[PDB]
Amino acid sequence: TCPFYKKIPGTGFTVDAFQYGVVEGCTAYFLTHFHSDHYAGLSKHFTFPVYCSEITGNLLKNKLHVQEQYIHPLPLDTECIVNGVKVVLLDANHCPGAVMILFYLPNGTVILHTGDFRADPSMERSLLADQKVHMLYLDTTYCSPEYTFPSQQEVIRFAINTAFEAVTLNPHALVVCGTYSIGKEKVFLAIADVLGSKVGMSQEKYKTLQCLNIPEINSLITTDMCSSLVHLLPMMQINFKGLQSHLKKCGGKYNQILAFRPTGWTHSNKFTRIADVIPQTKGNISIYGIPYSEHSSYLEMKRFVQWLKPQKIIPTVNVGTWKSRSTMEKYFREWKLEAGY
Ligand code: NI
């Protein structure tokens, strides 16, 4: 059965609620982004209205075969009317096509559902600036002060400089980047751009990228692995055995692999700066875990919430344990006392 924090009071709406069958009283299902914990349940057999971004709708149609007549894409930053209720989709700074959703309830209440997001000061100048928000359904993935990580721009500088140095020292080195979902495309696109290469990948992954409206994509990606010196592999294969096996398949073109695993947070964050990050090495294979996050750090989350000043916060992540829930509630009260709302 559908949990309460996926239901929007005073409407017929649910958010990211496709794995519970026919939800009682739901007239329109919203989908914030194309990540499997959120789309779980969707297919060609779905016959209710799904509301989403244009990019998410391309992925529903091509990857899951949802029929066109049930996909309702909405433009961003535009007031739209859905089953008699005004809504707005805003950029979530998560993966491609990911949105936050503002609902303007008929009784005067305003609700913001962040979906999954990486808070940023740029959000303080969207359509949020223009009215009060009463309730916030908040992505609390990293809601504890131990979660620090660098900006995306610092992480990409490290990756580009690392790859460019390695391949300039050894033109026979292959670079490999792990992936298992959409998101984090800058990692592999920035490395390919510095090296003067396209990114090579499976036909299934190429299909997924072609759904994303990324400009000049036919220029940056390919299925011809033999012409590429940056390869994308499933995340599961980014280990010494998987990589040794891949290097065999390349037929003596290469004699070294430099591989990247973009994780979210790892506890090497609490002791080490990005500049100081080192790989795991075995023989002619090196693996770098890089802290490229598409979720708010603690400080970024705190800043957003203290700017927005909601009357009530409903967490959507880490809600399954009493210890997690109690910890989160204590930070919310701190933020409110420090800021004065
Ligand atoms: Ni996500």
JSON list of C-alpha atoms in Angstrom, two decimals, residues 110-325:
[
{"chain": "A", "resi": 110, "resn": "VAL", "atom": "CA", "xyz": [1.11, 25.72, -1.42]},
{"chain": "A", "resi": 111, "resn": "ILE", "atom": "CA", "xyz": [3.17, 22.46, -1.36]},
{"chain": "A", "resi": 112, "resn": "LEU", "atom": "CA", "xyz": [6.67, 21.88, -2.86]},
{"chain": "A", "resi": 113, "resn": "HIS", "atom": "CA", "xyz": [7.76, 18.24, -3.53]},
{"chain": "A", "resi": 114, "resn": "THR", "atom": "CA", "xyz": [11.53, 18.27, -4.27]},
{"chain": "A", "resi": 115, "resn": "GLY", "atom": "CA", "xyz": [11.68, 14.76, -5.79]},
{"chain": "A", "resi": 116, "resn": "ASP", "atom": "CA", "xyz": [15.39, 13.93, -5.67]},
{"chain": "A", "resi": 117, "resn": "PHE", "atom": "CA", "xyz": [17.47, 17.21, -5.82]},
{"chain": "A", "resi": 118, "resn": "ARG", "atom": "CA", "xyz": [20.81, 18.90, -5.27]},
{"chain": "A", "resi": 119, "resn": "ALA", "atom": "CA", "xyz": [19.97, 22.24, -3.66]},
{"chain": "A", "resi": 120, "resn": "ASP", "atom": "CA", "xyz": [21.57, 25.29, -5.16]},
{"chain": "A", "resi": 121, "resn": "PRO", "atom": "CA", "xyz": [21.38, 29.12, -4.56]},
{"chain": "A", "resi": 122, "resn": "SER", "atom": "CA", "xyz": [20.13, 29.43, -8.18]},
{"chain": "A", "resi": 123, "resn": "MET", "atom": "CA", "xyz": [16.83, 27.98, -6.96]},
{"chain": "A", "resi": 124, "resn": "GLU", "atom": "CA", "xyz": [16.29, 31.09, -4.75]},
{"chain": "A", "resi": 125, "resn": "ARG", "atom": "CA", "xyz": [15.58, 32.94, -8.08]},
{"chain": "A", "resi": 126, "resn": "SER", "atom": "CA", "xyz": [13.11, 30.63, -9.72]},
{"chain": "A", "resi": 127, "resn": "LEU", "atom": "CA", "xyz": [9.27, 30.91, -9.35]},
{"chain": "A", "resi": 128, "resn": "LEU", "atom": "CA", "xyz": [9.82, 29.88, -5.67]},
{"chain": "A", "resi": 129, "resn": "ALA", "atom": "CA", "xyz": [10.80, 33.40, -4.83]},
{"chain": "A", "resi": 130, "resn": "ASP", "atom": "CA", "xyz": [7.20, 34.66, -5.54]},
{"chain": "A", "resi": 131, "resn": "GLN", "atom": "CA", "xyz": [5.05, 33.02, -2.83]},
{"chain": "A", "resi": 132, "resn": "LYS", "atom": "CA", "xyz": [4.97, 31.33, 0.49]},
{"chain": "A", "resi": 133, "resn": "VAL", "atom": "CA", "xyz": [5.27, 27.48, 0.77]},
{"chain": "A", "resi": 134, "resn": "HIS", "atom": "CA", "xyz": [3.41, 25.84, 3.61]},
{"chain": "A", "resi": 135, "resn": "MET", "atom": "CA", "xyz": [4.55, 22.19, 3.25]},
{"chain": "A", "resi": 136, "resn": "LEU", "atom": "CA", "xyz": [7.88, 20.79, 1.90]},
{"chain": "A", "resi": 137, "resn": "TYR", "atom": "CA", "xyz": [8.27, 17.10, 0.92]},
{"chain": "A", "resi": 138, "resn": "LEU", "atom": "CA", "xyz": [12.07, 17.03, 1.17]},
{"chain": "A", "resi": 139, "resn": "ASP", "atom": "CA", "xyz": [14.83, 14.69, -0.30]},
{"chain": "A", "resi": 140, "resn": "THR", "atom": "CA", "xyz": [16.72, 14.04, 2.95]},
{"chain": "A", "resi": 141, "resn": "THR", "atom": "CA", "xyz": [19.24, 11.48, 1.50]},
{"chain": "A", "resi": 142, "resn": "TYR", "atom": "CA", "xyz": [22.29, 13.20, 3.16]},
{"chain": "A", "resi": 143, "resn": "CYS", "atom": "CA", "xyz": [20.60, 14.92, 6.07]},
{"chain": "A", "resi": 144, "resn": "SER", "atom": "CA", "xyz": [23.48, 14.72, 8.62]},
{"chain": "A", "resi": 145, "resn": "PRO", "atom": "CA", "xyz": [26.47, 17.01, 9.02]},
{"chain": "A", "resi": 146, "resn": "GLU", "atom": "CA", "xyz": [29.04, 14.32, 8.24]},
{"chain": "A", "resi": 147, "resn": "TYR", "atom": "CA", "xyz": [27.95, 14.49, 4.60]},
{"chain": "A", "resi": 148, "resn": "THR", "atom": "CA", "xyz": [30.26, 17.00, 2.98]},
{"chain": "A", "resi": 149, "resn": "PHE", "atom": "CA", "xyz": [31.38, 16.73, -0.62]},
{"chain": "A", "resi": 150, "resn": "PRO", "atom": "CA", "xyz": [33.00, 19.04, -3.11]},
{"chain": "A", "resi": 151, "resn": "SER", "atom": "CA", "xyz": [31.23, 21.01, -5.91]},
{"chain": "A", "resi": 152, "resn": "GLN", "atom": "CA", "xyz": [30.56, 19.11, -9.15]},
{"chain": "A", "resi": 153, "resn": "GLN", "atom": "CA", "xyz": [32.90, 21.59, -10.94]},
{"chain": "A", "resi": 154, "resn": "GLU", "atom": "CA", "xyz": [35.92, 20.63, -8.58]},
{"chain": "A", "resi": 155, "resn": "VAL", "atom": "CA", "xyz": [35.25, 16.92, -9.15]},
{"chain": "A", "resi": 156, "resn": "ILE", "atom": "CA", "xyz": [35.15, 17.31, -12.93]},
{"chain": "A", "resi": 157, "resn": "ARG", "atom": "CA", "xyz": [38.41, 19.39, -12.87]},
{"chain": "A", "resi": 158, "resn": "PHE", "atom": "CA", "xyz": [40.07, 16.51, -11.00]},
{"chain": "A", "resi": 159, "resn": "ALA", "atom": "CA", "xyz": [38.76, 13.90, -13.46]},
{"chain": "A", "resi": 160, "resn": "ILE", "atom": "CA", "xyz": [39.75, 15.83, -16.64]},
{"chain": "A", "resi": 161, "resn": "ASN", "atom": "CA", "xyz": [43.28, 16.62, -15.28]},
{"chain": "A", "resi": 162, "resn": "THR", "atom": "CA", "xyz": [43.81, 12.97, -14.14]},
{"chain": "A", "resi": 163, "resn": "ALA", "atom": "CA", "xyz": [42.69, 11.45, -17.49]},
{"chain": "A", "resi": 164, "resn": "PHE", "atom": "CA", "xyz": [44.56, 14.01, -19.67]},
{"chain": "A", "resi": 165, "resn": "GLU", "atom": "CA", "xyz": [47.82, 13.44, -17.68]},
{"chain": "A", "resi": 166, "resn": "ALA", "atom": "CA", "xyz": [47.58, 9.60, -17.83]},
{"chain": "A", "resi": 167, "resn": "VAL", "atom": "CA", "xyz": [46.81, 9.33, -21.59]},
{"chain": "A", "resi": 168, "resn": "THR", "atom": "CA", "xyz": [49.46, 11.97, -22.50]},
{"chain": "A", "resi": 169, "resn": "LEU", "atom": "CA", "xyz": [52.08, 9.93, -20.57]},
{"chain": "A", "resi": 170, "resn": "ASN", "atom": "CA", "xyz": [50.78, 6.71, -22.22]},
{"chain": "A", "resi": 171, "resn": "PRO", "atom": "CA", "xyz": [48.78, 7.04, -25.50]},
{"chain": "A", "resi": 172, "resn": "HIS", "atom": "CA", "xyz": [47.99, 3.34, -25.18]},
{"chain": "A", "resi": 173, "resn": "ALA", "atom": "CA", "xyz": [46.00, 3.79, -21.95]},
{"chain": "A", "resi": 174, "resn": "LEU", "atom": "CA", "xyz": [42.12, 3.21, -22.16]},
{"chain": "A", "resi": 175, "resn": "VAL", "atom": "CA", "xyz": [39.83, 5.25, -19.88]},
{"chain": "A", "resi": 176, "resn": "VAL", "atom": "CA", "xyz": [36.71, 3.46, -18.56]},
{"chain": "A", "resi": 177, "resn": "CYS", "atom": "CA", "xyz": [33.76, 5.07, -16.68]},
{"chain": "A", "resi": 178, "resn": "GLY", "atom": "CA", "xyz": [31.09, 3.10, -14.75]},
{"chain": "A", "resi": 179, "resn": "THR", "atom": "CA", "xyz": [27.30, 3.79, -15.08]},
{"chain": "A", "resi": 180, "resn": "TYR", "atom": "CA", "xyz": [24.01, 2.08, -14.10]},
{"chain": "A", "resi": 181, "resn": "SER", "atom": "CA", "xyz": [21.37, 4.76, -14.41]},
{"chain": "A", "resi": 182, "resn": "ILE", "atom": "CA", "xyz": [20.99, 8.13, -16.06]},
{"chain": "A", "resi": 183, "resn": "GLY", "atom": "CA", "xyz": [22.78, 11.01, -14.32]},
{"chain": "A", "resi": 184, "resn": "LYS", "atom": "CA", "xyz": [26.44, 12.03, -13.93]},
{"chain": "A", "resi": 185, "resn": "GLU", "atom": "CA", "xyz": [26.94, 12.22, -17.76]},
{"chain": "A", "resi": 186, "resn": "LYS", "atom": "CA", "xyz": [29.34, 15.22, -17.32]},
{"chain": "A", "resi": 187, "resn": "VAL", "atom": "CA", "xyz": [31.98, 12.74, -15.90]},
{"chain": "A", "resi": 188, "resn": "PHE", "atom": "CA", "xyz": [32.40, 10.71, -19.16]},
{"chain": "A", "resi": 189, "resn": "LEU", "atom": "CA", "xyz": [31.52, 13.68, -21.54]},
{"chain": "A", "resi": 190, "resn": "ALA", "atom": "CA", "xyz": [34.16, 16.04, -20.01]},
{"chain": "A", "resi": 191, "resn": "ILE", "atom": "CA", "xyz": [36.91, 13.36, -20.14]},
{"chain": "A", "resi": 192, "resn": "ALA", "atom": "CA", "xyz": [36.08, 12.52, -23.80]},
{"chain": "A", "resi": 193, "resn": "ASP", "atom": "CA", "xyz": [36.14, 16.26, -24.74]},
{"chain": "A", "resi": 194, "resn": "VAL", "atom": "CA", "xyz": [39.71, 16.79, -23.26]},
{"chain": "A", "resi": 195, "resn": "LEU", "atom": "CA", "xyz": [40.99, 13.65, -25.01]},
{"chain": "A", "resi": 196, "resn": "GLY", "atom": "CA", "xyz": [39.45, 14.43, -28.47]},
{"chain": "A", "resi": 197, "resn": "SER", "atom": "CA", "xyz": [37.45, 11.23, -28.46]},
{"chain": "A", "resi": 198, "resn": "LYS", "atom": "CA", "xyz": [33.76, 10.10, -28.56]},
{"chain": "A", "resi": 199, "resn": "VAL", "atom": "CA", "xyz": [32.46, 7.97, -25.74]},
{"chain": "A", "resi": 200, "resn": "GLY", "atom": "CA", "xyz": [31.86, 4.33, -26.74]},
{"chain": "A", "resi": 201, "resn": "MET", "atom": "CA", "xyz": [29.06, 2.33, -25.24]},
{"chain": "A", "resi": 202, "resn": "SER", "atom": "CA", "xyz": [26.42, -0.45, -25.74]},
{"chain": "A", "resi": 203, "resn": "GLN", "atom": "CA", "xyz": [23.46, 0.07, -28.03]},
{"chain": "A", "resi": 204, "resn": "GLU", "atom": "CA", "xyz": [21.08, 0.05, -24.96]},
{"chain": "A", "resi": 205, "resn": "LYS", "atom": "CA", "xyz": [23.00, 2.88, -23.29]},
{"chain": "A", "resi": 206, "resn": "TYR", "atom": "CA", "xyz": [23.32, 4.87, -26.54]},
{"chain": "A", "resi": 207, "resn": "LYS", "atom": "CA", "xyz": [19.48, 4.57, -26.90]},
{"chain": "A", "resi": 208, "resn": "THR", "atom": "CA", "xyz": [19.00, 5.96, -23.35]},
{"chain": "A", "resi": 209, "resn": "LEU", "atom": "CA", "xyz": [21.31, 8.97, -24.02]},
{"chain": "A", "resi": 210, "resn": "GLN", "atom": "CA", "xyz": [19.55, 9.77, -27.30]},
{"chain": "A", "resi": 211, "resn": "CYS", "atom": "CA", "xyz": [16.32, 10.39, -25.27]},
{"chain": "A", "resi": 212, "resn": "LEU", "atom": "CA", "xyz": [17.93, 13.23, -23.19]},
{"chain": "A", "resi": 213, "resn": "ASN", "atom": "CA", "xyz": [17.93, 16.47, -25.36]},
{"chain": "A", "resi": 214, "resn": "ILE", "atom": "CA", "xyz": [21.63, 17.01, -24.66]},
{"chain": "A", "resi": 215, "resn": "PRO", "atom": "CA", "xyz": [22.85, 19.42, -27.46]},
{"chain": "A", "resi": 216, "resn": "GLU", "atom": "CA", "xyz": [25.40, 18.16, -29.95]},
{"chain": "A", "resi": 217, "resn": "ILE", "atom": "CA", "xyz": [25.14, 14.56, -28.56]},
{"chain": "A", "resi": 218, "resn": "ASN", "atom": "CA", "xyz": [25.59, 12.92, -31.98]},
{"chain": "A", "resi": 219, "resn": "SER", "atom": "CA", "xyz": [29.04, 14.71, -31.74]},
{"chain": "A", "resi": 220, "resn": "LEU", "atom": "CA", "xyz": [30.04, 13.13, -28.32]},
{"chain": "A", "resi": 221, "resn": "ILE", "atom": "CA", "xyz": [28.83, 9.49, -28.18]},
{"chain": "A", "resi": 222, "resn": "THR", "atom": "CA", "xyz": [29.05, 6.34, -30.32]},
{"chain": "A", "resi": 223, "resn": "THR", "atom": "CA", "xyz": [28.42, 2.56, -30.44]},
{"chain": "A", "resi": 224, "resn": "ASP", "atom": "CA", "xyz": [31.70, 1.97, -32.28]},
{"chain": "A", "resi": 225, "resn": "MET", "atom": "CA", "xyz": [33.95, 0.94, -29.46]},
{"chain": "A", "resi": 226, "resn": "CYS", "atom": "CA", "xyz": [36.99, 0.51, -31.78]},
{"chain": "A", "resi": 227, "resn": "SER", "atom": "CA", "xyz": [37.06, 4.22, -32.65]},
{"chain": "A", "resi": 228, "resn": "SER", "atom": "CA", "xyz": [36.76, 5.44, -29.01]},
{"chain": "A", "resi": 229, "resn": "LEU", "atom": "CA", "xyz": [39.33, 5.70, -26.16]},
{"chain": "A", "resi": 230, "resn": "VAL", "atom": "CA", "xyz": [36.75, 6.42, -23.47]},
{"chain": "A", "resi": 231, "resn": "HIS", "atom": "CA", "xyz": [34.46, 3.37, -22.84]},
{"chain": "A", "resi": 232, "resn": "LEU", "atom": "CA", "xyz": [31.34, 3.14, -20.67]},
{"chain": "A", "resi": 233, "resn": "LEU", "atom": "CA", "xyz": [30.70, -0.10, -18.78]},
{"chain": "A", "resi": 234, "resn": "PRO", "atom": "CA", "xyz": [28.12, -1.24, -16.26]},
{"chain": "A", "resi": 235, "resn": "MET", "atom": "CA", "xyz": [29.07, -0.19, -12.73]},
{"chain": "A", "resi": 236, "resn": "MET", "atom": "CA", "xyz": [29.29, -3.85, -11.68]},
{"chain": "A", "resi": 237, "resn": "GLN", "atom": "CA", "xyz": [32.18, -4.47, -14.04]},
{"chain": "A", "resi": 238, "resn": "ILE", "atom": "CA", "xyz": [34.33, -1.62, -12.44]},
{"chain": "A", "resi": 239, "resn": "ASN", "atom": "CA", "xyz": [36.63, -3.97, -10.50]},
{"chain": "A", "resi": 240, "resn": "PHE", "atom": "CA", "xyz": [39.99, -5.62, -11.26]},
{"chain": "A", "resi": 241, "resn": "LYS", "atom": "CA", "xyz": [38.50, -8.84, -12.75]},
{"chain": "A", "resi": 242, "resn": "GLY", "atom": "CA", "xyz": [35.96, -7.00, -14.91]},
{"chain": "A", "resi": 243, "resn": "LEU", "atom": "CA", "xyz": [38.49, -4.57, -16.21]},
{"chain": "A", "resi": 244, "resn": "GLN", "atom": "CA", "xyz": [41.21, -7.22, -16.95]},
{"chain": "A", "resi": 245, "resn": "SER", "atom": "CA", "xyz": [38.54, -9.05, -19.02]},
{"chain": "A", "resi": 246, "resn": "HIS", "atom": "CA", "xyz": [37.58, -5.90, -20.89]},
{"chain": "A", "resi": 247, "resn": "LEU", "atom": "CA", "xyz": [41.24, -5.13, -21.73]},
{"chain": "A", "resi": 248, "resn": "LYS", "atom": "CA", "xyz": [41.58, -8.60, -23.32]},
{"chain": "A", "resi": 249, "resn": "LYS", "atom": "CA", "xyz": [38.62, -7.84, -25.60]},
{"chain": "A", "resi": 250, "resn": "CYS", "atom": "CA", "xyz": [40.36, -4.76, -26.97]},
{"chain": "A", "resi": 251, "resn": "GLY", "atom": "CA", "xyz": [42.84, -6.96, -28.91]},
{"chain": "A", "resi": 252, "resn": "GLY", "atom": "CA", "xyz": [46.16, -5.37, -27.94]},
{"chain": "A", "resi": 253, "resn": "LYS", "atom": "CA", "xyz": [45.14, -1.81, -28.77]},
{"chain": "A", "resi": 254, "resn": "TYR", "atom": "CA", "xyz": [45.68, -0.84, -25.13]},
{"chain": "A", "resi": 255, "resn": "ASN", "atom": "CA", "xyz": [48.09, -1.89, -22.39]},
{"chain": "A", "resi": 256, "resn": "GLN", "atom": "CA", "xyz": [46.71, 0.04, -19.32]},
{"chain": "A", "resi": 257, "resn": "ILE", "atom": "CA", "xyz": [43.23, 1.03, -17.91]},
{"chain": "A", "resi": 258, "resn": "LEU", "atom": "CA", "xyz": [42.40, 4.14, -15.90]},
{"chain": "A", "resi": 259, "resn": "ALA", "atom": "CA", "xyz": [38.80, 3.72, -14.54]},
{"chain": "A", "resi": 260, "resn": "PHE", "atom": "CA", "xyz": [36.36, 5.97, -12.72]},
{"chain": "A", "resi": 261, "resn": "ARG", "atom": "CA", "xyz": [33.49, 5.05, -10.31]},
{"chain": "A", "resi": 262, "resn": "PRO", "atom": "CA", "xyz": [31.35, 8.11, -9.60]},
{"chain": "A", "resi": 263, "resn": "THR", "atom": "CA", "xyz": [29.89, 7.26, -6.19]},
{"chain": "A", "resi": 264, "resn": "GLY", "atom": "CA", "xyz": [27.73, 9.58, -4.03]},
{"chain": "A", "resi": 265, "resn": "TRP", "atom": "CA", "xyz": [29.36, 9.93, -0.56]},
{"chain": "A", "resi": 266, "resn": "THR", "atom": "CA", "xyz": [32.03, 7.64, 0.87]},
{"chain": "A", "resi": 267, "resn": "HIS", "atom": "CA", "xyz": [33.73, 8.16, 4.42]},
{"chain": "A", "resi": 268, "resn": "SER", "atom": "CA", "xyz": [37.07, 8.93, 2.71]},
{"chain": "A", "resi": 269, "resn": "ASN", "atom": "CA", "xyz": [35.21, 12.39, 2.38]},
{"chain": "A", "resi": 270, "resn": "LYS", "atom": "CA", "xyz": [35.49, 12.99, 6.17]},
{"chain": "A", "resi": 271, "resn": "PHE", "atom": "CA", "xyz": [39.34, 12.84, 6.09]},
{"chain": "A", "resi": 272, "resn": "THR", "atom": "CA", "xyz": [40.53, 13.64, 2.54]},
{"chain": "A", "resi": 273, "resn": "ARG", "atom": "CA", "xyz": [40.23, 16.62, 0.10]},
{"chain": "A", "resi": 274, "resn": "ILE", "atom": "CA", "xyz": [39.49, 16.03, -3.63]},
{"chain": "A", "resi": 275, "resn": "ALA", "atom": "CA", "xyz": [43.03, 17.12, -4.52]},
{"chain": "A", "resi": 276, "resn": "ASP", "atom": "CA", "xyz": [44.37, 14.32, -2.29]},
{"chain": "A", "resi": 277, "resn": "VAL", "atom": "CA", "xyz": [42.28, 11.39, -3.81]},
{"chain": "A", "resi": 278, "resn": "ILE", "atom": "CA", "xyz": [44.28, 8.33, -4.92]},
{"chain": "A", "resi": 279, "resn": "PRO", "atom": "CA", "xyz": [43.34, 5.20, -6.80]},
{"chain": "A", "resi": 280, "resn": "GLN", "atom": "CA", "xyz": [43.33, 1.51, -6.00]},
{"chain": "A", "resi": 281, "resn": "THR", "atom": "CA", "xyz": [45.90, -0.15, -8.29]},
{"chain": "A", "resi": 282, "resn": "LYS", "atom": "CA", "xyz": [46.68, -3.72, -9.38]},
{"chain": "A", "resi": 283, "resn": "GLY", "atom": "CA", "xyz": [49.22, -4.18, -12.14]},
{"chain": "A", "resi": 284, "resn": "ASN", "atom": "CA", "xyz": [48.27, -2.09, -15.16]},
{"chain": "A", "resi": 285, "resn": "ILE", "atom": "CA", "xyz": [44.73, -1.23, -13.79]},
{"chain": "A", "resi": 286, "resn": "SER", "atom": "CA", "xyz": [43.92, 1.82, -11.61]},
{"chain": "A", "resi": 287, "resn": "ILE", "atom": "CA", "xyz": [40.41, 2.63, -10.18]},
{"chain": "A", "resi": 288, "resn": "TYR", "atom": "CA", "xyz": [39.41, 6.06, -8.84]},
{"chain": "A", "resi": 289, "resn": "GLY", "atom": "CA", "xyz": [36.25, 6.49, -6.67]},
{"chain": "A", "resi": 290, "resn": "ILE", "atom": "CA", "xyz": [35.20, 10.12, -7.21]},
{"chain": "A", "resi": 291, "resn": "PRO", "atom": "CA", "xyz": [32.55, 11.91, -4.96]},
{"chain": "A", "resi": 292, "resn": "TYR", "atom": "CA", "xyz": [30.29, 13.25, -7.73]},
{"chain": "A", "resi": 293, "resn": "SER", "atom": "CA", "xyz": [26.90, 13.81, -6.02]},
{"chain": "A", "resi": 294, "resn": "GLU", "atom": "CA", "xyz": [23.49, 14.54, -7.51]},
{"chain": "A", "resi": 295, "resn": "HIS", "atom": "CA", "xyz": [21.97, 15.05, -4.04]},
{"chain": "A", "resi": 296, "resn": "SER", "atom": "CA", "xyz": [22.28, 17.99, -1.63]},
{"chain": "A", "resi": 297, "resn": "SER", "atom": "CA", "xyz": [25.07, 18.00, 0.89]},
{"chain": "A", "resi": 298, "resn": "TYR", "atom": "CA", "xyz": [23.94, 18.78, 4.47]},
{"chain": "A", "resi": 299, "resn": "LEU", "atom": "CA", "xyz": [25.00, 22.40, 4.25]},
{"chain": "A", "resi": 300, "resn": "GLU", "atom": "CA", "xyz": [23.31, 22.88, 0.81]},
{"chain": "A", "resi": 301, "resn": "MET", "atom": "CA", "xyz": [20.04, 21.31, 2.17]},
{"chain": "A", "resi": 302, "resn": "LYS", "atom": "CA", "xyz": [20.15, 23.47, 5.31]},
{"chain": "A", "resi": 303, "resn": "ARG", "atom": "CA", "xyz": [20.64, 26.68, 3.30]},
{"chain": "A", "resi": 304, "resn": "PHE", "atom": "CA", "xyz": [17.66, 25.90, 1.02]},
{"chain": "A", "resi": 305, "resn": "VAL", "atom": "CA", "xyz": [15.28, 25.09, 3.85]},
{"chain": "A", "resi": 306, "resn": "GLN", "atom": "CA", "xyz": [16.35, 28.17, 5.95]},
{"chain": "A", "resi": 307, "resn": "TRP", "atom": "CA", "xyz": [15.72, 30.35, 2.80]},
{"chain": "A", "resi": 308, "resn": "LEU", "atom": "CA", "xyz": [12.34, 28.73, 1.98]},
{"chain": "A", "resi": 309, "resn": "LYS", "atom": "CA", "xyz": [11.00, 28.84, 5.57]},
{"chain": "A", "resi": 310, "resn": "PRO", "atom": "CA", "xyz": [8.32, 26.11, 5.29]},
{"chain": "A", "resi": 311, "resn": "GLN", "atom": "CA", "xyz": [5.72, 25.64, 7.97]},
{"chain": "A", "resi": 312, "resn": "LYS", "atom": "CA", "xyz": [5.93, 21.82, 7.89]},
{"chain": "A", "resi": 313, "resn": "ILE", "atom": "CA", "xyz": [8.66, 19.38, 6.52]},
{"chain": "A", "resi": 314, "resn": "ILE", "atom": "CA", "xyz": [7.86, 15.82, 5.42]},
{"chain": "A", "resi": 315, "resn": "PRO", "atom": "CA", "xyz": [11.03, 13.76, 4.73]},
{"chain": "A", "resi": 316, "resn": "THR", "atom": "CA", "xyz": [10.91, 11.35, 1.78]},
{"chain": "A", "resi": 317, "resn": "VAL", "atom": "CA", "xyz": [14.28, 9.53, 2.42]},
{"chain": "A", "resi": 318, "resn": "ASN", "atom": "CA", "xyz": [15.65, 7.57, 5.45]},
{"chain": "A", "resi": 319, "resn": "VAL", "atom": "CA", "xyz": [12.07, 7.33, 6.86]},
{"chain": "A", "resi": 320, "resn": "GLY", "atom": "CA", "xyz": [12.24, 3.64, 7.74]},
{"chain": "A", "resi": 321, "resn": "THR", "atom": "CA", "xyz": [13.97, 3.77, 11.16]},
{"chain": "A", "resi": 322, "resn": "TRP", "atom": "CA", "xyz": [13.03, 5.63, 14.37]},
{"chain": "A", "resi": 323, "resn": "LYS", "atom": "CA", "xyz": [16.72, 6.69, 14.91]},
{"chain": "A", "resi": 324, "resn": "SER", "atom": "CA", "xyz": [16.85, 8.25, 11.39]},
{"chain": "A", "resi": 325, "resn": "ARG", "atom": "CA", "xyz": [13.52, 9.98, 11.78]}
]
